Design a protein around this ligand. Structure first.
Ligand SMILES: Nc1ncnc2c1ncn2[C@@H]1O[C@H](COP(=O)(O)OP(=O)(O)O)[C@@H](O)[C@H]1O
Ligand SMILES: Nc1ncnc2c1ncn2[C@@H]1O[C@H](COP(=O)(O)OP(=O)(O)O)[C@@H](O)[C@H]1O
Ligand SMILES: Nc1ncnc2c1ncn2[C@@H]1O[C@H](COP(=O)(O)OP(=O)(O)O)[C@@H](O)[C@H]1O
Ligand SMILES: [Mg+2]
Ligand SMILES: [Mg+2]
Ligand SMILES: [Mg+2]
Lengths: 372, 372, 372
């Protein structure tokens, strides 16, 4: 088919569309909800479960459950239902007349890819498919060849150093600190002021609060000293019922745990330290082009002032002679999808799909020896 | 053809050009590298190998390999690739419409010259060719007729005593100490300060450090005593990644192993003793002109103060009545190519080529009987 | 004193004892852990740090840090604490009334030895001391005089060719691939099955499973083909919490990085190839005894079937006429300590110590001129 489906499936969001476009047409949260109450009324549609915005609208009754956890798929029936919703009820295109493109984080269990390709070749009967790393697709979107990518989505944060068309597999780091931990920490620290949120429906509200009211502080101690005279930092948010919530230092305390994982109990290095270490694991004469090309991807990298603090933190480690620049495109959120769409439409790539006949003979193990 | 090709082919560098000029136009390292990594990106030219500066600029990915070792050519396909790069992509001239001149170190395996002739007559279809010793060409460059030449390049160091128009083949010495062992010894003793270099790419960095930061000391014990108060000898170098490396007595410890091969494990004599022994092997009535005419050639002899120490070392052995003079032209590096260009353009030499029809009947054995 | 301490200090383990014995009485891991948590309870022992087994038993709380990295001591205070624990709280012997013997890998920074002497002479006030290479001590333990020793410990692997009482310093090779890289690679490849270990307390568990469940395969591709029908290779291990972990081809995949360093990205040759190159670096008339005397030392050389593969690989390189034998004593781990104890008790060696009055005049620089 001339147009191929590219369906990026992250840990928190589902973004799908067609190859060759610029922005996806189908974007929605990747949750599945089920009723947990009596259901006295008769004659109303007794749907077993709701997926996507249909569940986000009635979360008040349901019990939302994310099928993807830290990139790992736990419940596969929910994943099949979500894929069905993307293919039929959201994109209105049959899957057996188009090839599909998939994304999956590096350093992941091998059974995940085999089960993904088995599902897509059995329950959907697609003609071809291909799985690609998020970081290489994000680099494809930026129209570059050398540099490192810090992809920070909802479940995993990882780095992939890429030189002029070549990848270094030994320098690929991966830490399991992501947006879900940020939301959990915000929920935990919001009880100091008195506001308590427990259920998944309230977890969605806390995530919404984090999305549009939190910023990264360039300096932490100075900002804390400024917030000590709590006059110019407190904002307000509106609850669905009508109550007003005010927060102070939690605007910058919550996003700082990326740079200081010790706050949430993890013993590890911050994102700046991880990317510096990933730089240092490469050769010596290719470190300059990595320093000069720092690409920010993912949805968690949209906090205001993140780049201005990352530059200072990395400069504090790198030698003074080198110059440091981080790339902050205005379209961080859909960079992986844009790169996948660009790769799918390329005329060179169309000979590296996985045809149905090849899987019929090589079996599900074809992904490991044909995709990476 | 009025203008003949002269492509001097040393063990470390390739310098090619046109007969009749003063300096070669094509000079570049003689290395061939190959990728060793994944190659995940598509659409970028997947070249199998890179030759010359194209590989020197990307050494960070490849694994560089010198095809010529101690003057002995081990891999012939790499040599064919090197010659192809010299002729087509760097000199922009056809090889089948020009005659070529080649150089090789004396006391060499007989297979090398016949293989070179066969390759040049089969894969390139040259009309004529000729092979000559480096030392005699270096003598030609200086415009002299009597004297000895110490050629010290990258793989071999040798001597050729020459009286008026005649050569003494029994007095030709050859020791296998050259620049490569110098870089290896510098790498070995550079670990004392903590800096460790292992791979080939770092070997090039160490070679660059040696080329512009090492000098020959007139006295060794006095210089070591001076460096004991390590204040006035330390310098600094800038690594590609930005780190600063400082070295002390390693500036003069490394170049001395030419005068003292016992440091690097070999139980032989130094270059001064080698040239003195080569002088003494000739007749008695021709020694004075040899003492008065000492010609220094090659790239290894570019260390500052080498002539001042060689003069003292040779004088300490020779009888006090005789006078010692060593010539150190500002253009040691390209003396062999200059002499080759001078000889090629000479009208007398135009009868000592090797015609293609001569090779068609004599076979590859014509070189041994028509070149030396 | 009649009895002298021989306190061997490797990069992963500390083994100390008394001269004249057969096995050391003091063996413990060389780690220093510090608390990282609140410490709400009052009245309990608030020790700043724990050393040795006292920290190995409470790793669940602490953050262990190795003071020695690749033979180089980075943090000197931790080394002082470890030596204090070794002398007082584990051996119960005052250090000022006994002489001590130390070991250190070759081709090491010069500051290391002099700082070690300075520590031992200022902050312990020992009467005399001496440092020695591990390989020569391992040869001493075996009761031989000619042969090469491949010492493979935790941080460094090195070779020392030894003829009849003489050492060839130009043939000493050293690669930085050792057990720590083995553990890191095992951690990296253990995540394919789903199990992920990140913390140092989990690094200890990974080292433990590596120690007693991994073996070296004689043939790699045949073993992979056998493991394809994964029935007869899988084993089971018990993590402390209670779960079960089972692995397949990881039993032999990780050991093999000694022979194929390209798996971990390093551009070097295998240990067999480094040993062969070190053999070929010597003279021609001494290679026979080196071939006929191969001594294995270190703790990394205890993988089952290592000798059966090393002998095959070495025979595949050496000429067929020569016979190859490899010594695999049942006491590889403590061979260095045994050799040190043997040498310390020797009567001839008694005149080669470093007296305190000599250090008071010559200074810390006496080690370089009186030890090697
Ligand atoms: N404007 C924003 N400000 C702060 N955080 C955001 C914003 N938009 C999204 N996020 C965070 O990004 C996460 C979603 O990342 P996502 O784009 O789904 O990555 P992926 O598609 O790779 O899973 C959410 O958990 C949310 O907390
Ligand atoms: N300026 C310099 N100072 C010191 N050594 C040099 C310098 N330039 C070149 N060399 C040494 O000379 C070697 C190259 O010699 P080269 O001119 O290629 O001889 P040939 O052409 O006969 O091979 C290099 O290995 C390098 O170590
Ligand atoms: N039984 C065993 N099997 C496999 N590996 C082992 C075994 N015992 C120890 N090791 C390895 O040896 C290393 C320790 O070496 P060690 O004896 O400390 O050398 P050194 O004392 O010279 O530092 C550890 O990293 C461990 O992985
Ligand atoms: Mg993403
Ligand atoms: Mg030369
Ligand atoms: Mg050891």
């Amino acid at each position: 088919e001339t147009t191929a489906l590219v369906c990026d499936n992250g840990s928190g969001l589902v973004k799908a569309g067609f190859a060759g476009d610029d922005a996806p047409r189908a974007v929605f949260p990747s949750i599945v909800g089920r009723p947990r109450h009596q259901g006295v009324m008769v004659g109303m549609g007794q749907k077993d479960s709701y997926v996507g915005d249909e569940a986000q609208s009635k979360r008040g009754i349901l019990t939302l459950k994310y099928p993807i956890e830290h990139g790992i798929i736990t419940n596969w029936d929910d994943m099949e239902k979500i894929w069905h919703h993307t293919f039929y009820n959201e994109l209105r295109v049959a899957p057996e007349e188009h090839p599909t493109l998939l994304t999956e984080a590096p350093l992941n269990p091998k059974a995940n890819r085999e089960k993904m390709t088995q599902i897509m070749f059995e329950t959907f009967n697609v003609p071809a498919m291909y799985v690609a790393i998020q970081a290489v697709l994000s680099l494809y979107a930026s129209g570059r060849t050398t540099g490192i990518v810090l992809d920070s989505g909802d479940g995993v944060t990882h780095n992939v150093p890429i030189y002029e068309g070549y990848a270094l597999p030994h320098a690929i780091m991966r830490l399991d600190l992501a947006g879900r931990d940020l939301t959990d920490y915000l929920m935990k620290i919001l009880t100091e002021r008195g506001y308590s949120f427990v259920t998944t429906a309230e977890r969605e509200i806390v995530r919404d609060i984090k999305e549009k009211l939190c910023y990264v502080a360039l300096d932490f101690e100075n900002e804390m000293a400024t917030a000590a005279s709590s006059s110019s930092l407190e904002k307000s948010y509106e609850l669905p019922d009508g109550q007003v919530i005010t927060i102070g230092n939690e605007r910058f305390r919550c996003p700082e745990t990326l740079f200081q994982p010790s706050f949430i109990g993890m013993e590890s290095a911050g994102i700046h330290e991880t990317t510096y270490n990933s730089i240092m694991k490469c050769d010596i004469d290719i470190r300059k082009d990595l320093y000069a090309n720092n690409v920010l991807s993912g949805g968690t990298t949209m906090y205001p002032g993140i780049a201005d603090r990352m530059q200072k933190e990395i400069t504090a480690l790198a030698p003074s002679t080198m110059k440091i620049k981080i790339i902050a495109p205005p379209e961080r959120k859909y960079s992986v999808w844009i790169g996948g769409s660009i790769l799918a439409s390329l005329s060179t790539f169309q000979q590296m799909w996985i045809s149905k006949q090849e899987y019929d003979e090589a079996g599900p193990s074809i992904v490991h020896r044909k995709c990476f």
